[PDB]
């Protein structure tokens, strides 16, 4: 009750990024805080120049039923996955000058929901088999697989320290897992329906889940309980995406009311509507240096705010 | 102008990428996407061509999970193929109740409000030989028809077709499965095209 409210935080669309035609499902920020990657059902994965609203790279796909994409922290590779159970990894920096697919991790049977890099050689995947997995890209086979879900897994995130990861499934449950051994560190519950969006707080001591029951939640990794609930009475639709900012004050939450809401992550009560899409908000991200916010929705337009 | 000698080339690169994206979207925006449920791991995609038309059919029966978190990615399909049998009306697992529940769930779902449905009934010969000694009275005690295939078949057809709650927006094109299936689906999608086409320019 001693925290001052950030108040009304208005933002203006500096850049509208056009070129995606069909629906958009995923986006991730680059490491230099200038490049972007977006995934659509055109079978397209695009790396945008953010400062000048330019296009740096465009990549066609093989399975157009995508649900996720990733950006290598060293800027060398990208990755994607979806309803086809396998995770594809592409090399950006070749003397040939074209992006080539270097690895095809296979061995799942439920639809892939997400994928995030560990370094240039280690990745983590979660699919509809109710199982997560750590893959060693050089070898081509899993080094450890994680079982214990009864429903499909829809999200995961990798810690900044790069030692753990948290997943969430259609069982209204989430699970924190160690990486190099295989144990299930913890299992969280509380949602009234399936969980479809998770994010990892930058300090590595909390995480936030989005649900298809008109609620967002923050849990703590150590206390083993839910911290905060984020919902409003005028809202009846479901969450789709969640992300934080550099300090963490602004929790950007997508919705199905067509309006991204920026929430004051500490007071649990504020809605800085970033209205301006005509459809469902799918994906959203924040730069490493905090210089912008990008949101993408079902209307095929990607917007940059600050 | 506030550019260097090479930012011009950066801009040109972006322009080529935009042209390529637009061309690919034009190429991929004129194909008929049909979803098959029940004729022929993860999505099994099938492609074929008929009368200058590109049919992309989705055989999705290999997934072992529910449809709530999985079906909305098919919002824009032209049509749904539905395949069920008639011979298994009495086999307690029965099967008619399961098929009827599936059809009611599919037809009255929001994503397919304007989306028509093609419906197939197959394994009719086994049904015809069954009714010779196993009439529909085992599964339809209220039925009071003759011991012939035609009356019972019409009864079942009207039973499924009376489940439509969207009579003035989408129809159901029922056909007894017997190459007439391809012709049936082609005519159905032509009529879907016409009805959805004289709708976006008024004309009611």
């Amino acid at each position, epitope marked *: 009750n001693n925290i001052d409210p950030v108040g009304r935080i208005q933002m203006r669309t500096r850049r509208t990024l056009r070129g995606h035609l069909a629906k958009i499902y995923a986006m991730h920020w680059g490491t230099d805080s200038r490049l972007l990657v977006s995934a659509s059902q055109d079978g397209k994965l695009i790396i945008w120049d953010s400062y000048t609203t330019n296009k740096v790279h465009a990549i066609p796909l093989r399975s157009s039923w995508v649900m996720t994409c990733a950006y290598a922290p060293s800027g060398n590779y990208v990755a994607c996955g979806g309803l086809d159970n396998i995770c594809s990894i592409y090399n950006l920096k070749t*003397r040939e*000058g*074209n992006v080539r697919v270097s690895r095809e991790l296979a061995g799942h049977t439920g639809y892939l929901s997400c994928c995030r890099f560990l370094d240039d050689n280690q990745i983590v995947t979660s699919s509809g088999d109710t199982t997560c997995a750590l893959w060693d890209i050089e070898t081509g086979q899993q080094t450890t697989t994680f079982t214990g879900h009864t429903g499909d897994v829809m999200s995961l995130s990798l810690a900044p320290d790069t030692r753990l990861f948290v997943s969430g499934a259609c069982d209204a449950s989430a699970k924190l897992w160690d990486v190099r051994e295989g144990m299930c560190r913890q299992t969280f519950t509380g949602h009234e329906s399936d969980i479809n969006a998770i994010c990892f707080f930058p300090n590595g001591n909390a995480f936030a889940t989005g649900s298809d029951d008109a609620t967002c939640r923050l849990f703590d990794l150590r206390a083993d309980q839910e911290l905060m609930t984020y919902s409003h009475d005028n809202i009846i639709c479901g969450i789709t995406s969640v992300s934080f900012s550099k300090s963490g004050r602004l929790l950007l939450a997508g919705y199905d009311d067509f309006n991204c809401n920026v929430w004051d992550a500490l007071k649990a009560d504020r809605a800085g509507v970033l209205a301006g899409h005509d459809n469902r908000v799918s994906c959203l991200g924040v730069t490493d240096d905090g210089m912008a916010v990008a949101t993408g929705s079902w209307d095929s337009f990607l917007k940059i705010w600050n | 102008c*506030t550019l*260097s000698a090479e930012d011009k*080339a*950066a801009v*040109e690169r972006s322009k080529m990428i935009d042209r390529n994206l637009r061309e690919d979207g034009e190429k991929a925006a004129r194909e008929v996407k049909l979803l098959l449920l029940g004729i022929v791991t993860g999505i099994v995609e099938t492609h074929f061509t008929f009368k200058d038309l590109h049919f992309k059919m989705f055989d999705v029966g290999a997934q072992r999970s529910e449809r709530k978190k999985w079906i909305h990615c098919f919002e824009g399909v032209t049509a749904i193929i539905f395949c069920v049998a008639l011979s298994d009306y009495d086999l307690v697992l029965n099967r008619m109740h399961e098929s009827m529940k599936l059809f009611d769930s599919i037809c009255n779902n929001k994503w397919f409000t304007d989306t028509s449905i093609i419906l197939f009934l197959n394994k009719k010969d086994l049904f015809e030989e069954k009714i010779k000694k196993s009439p529909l009275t085992i599964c339809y005690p209220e039925y009071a028809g003759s011991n012939t295939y035609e009356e019972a078949a019409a009864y079942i057809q009207c039973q499924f077709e009376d489940l439509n709650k969207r009579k003035d927006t989408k129809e159901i094109y029922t056909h007894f499965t017997c190459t007439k299936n391809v012709q049936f689906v082609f005519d159905a999608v032509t009529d879907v095209i016409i009805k959805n086409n004289l709708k976006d320019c008024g004309l009611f």
Partner: single-chain antibody
Amino acid sequence: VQLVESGGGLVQPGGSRKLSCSASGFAFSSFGMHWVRQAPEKGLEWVAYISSGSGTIYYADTVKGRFTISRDDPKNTLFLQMTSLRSEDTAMYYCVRSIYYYGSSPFDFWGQGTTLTVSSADIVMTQATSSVPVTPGESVSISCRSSKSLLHSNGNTYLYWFLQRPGQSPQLLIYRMSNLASGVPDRFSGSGSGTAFTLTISRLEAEDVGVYYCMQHLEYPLTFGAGTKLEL
């Protein structure tokens, strides 16, 4: 990658001559290409430039209206057609790749070069000296001057440092005055201030002596210096 060129030789004054370039082992049609040259006894000179998509075309003021550049993407080939050739045009030429997107490394590969012996406010750079005798085992410091400041509005700087060994073609040591091209030993450096910049080869070893050059790429035309001859 690989770049192999044809057309060199001895040509009479006047007339015309065409030099062709064949690329191998990379995506040819996503690259801009430059034709550069070097005098038989003096430094380098730039000729011409074509960009991605056969759009922008640039020529030097000396060669304007008499040299024309072109490309052919299905067969991965590049052309410089050369009219109005005079005895001052004797040189040996280089075809240089360059990919212009954010963060790329232009001038990262040069061809083997082909000999061709012929029987204003432009920024011209003055090479600071012409010979510095430095024994092996001691660092080498070379500098060059510029006619005009090179900090553009977008925070960039455009100075390039190249090295050439006897009987050889140049390679990219430094691009944009501060960056080190991958594939060369990491004991080089570059620095300096406005219009006055410097290359450094630390802990000189064998096969690390020869001619050194700098370049400006802020606005066309492109020019060069004289080339410091580091000897043993």
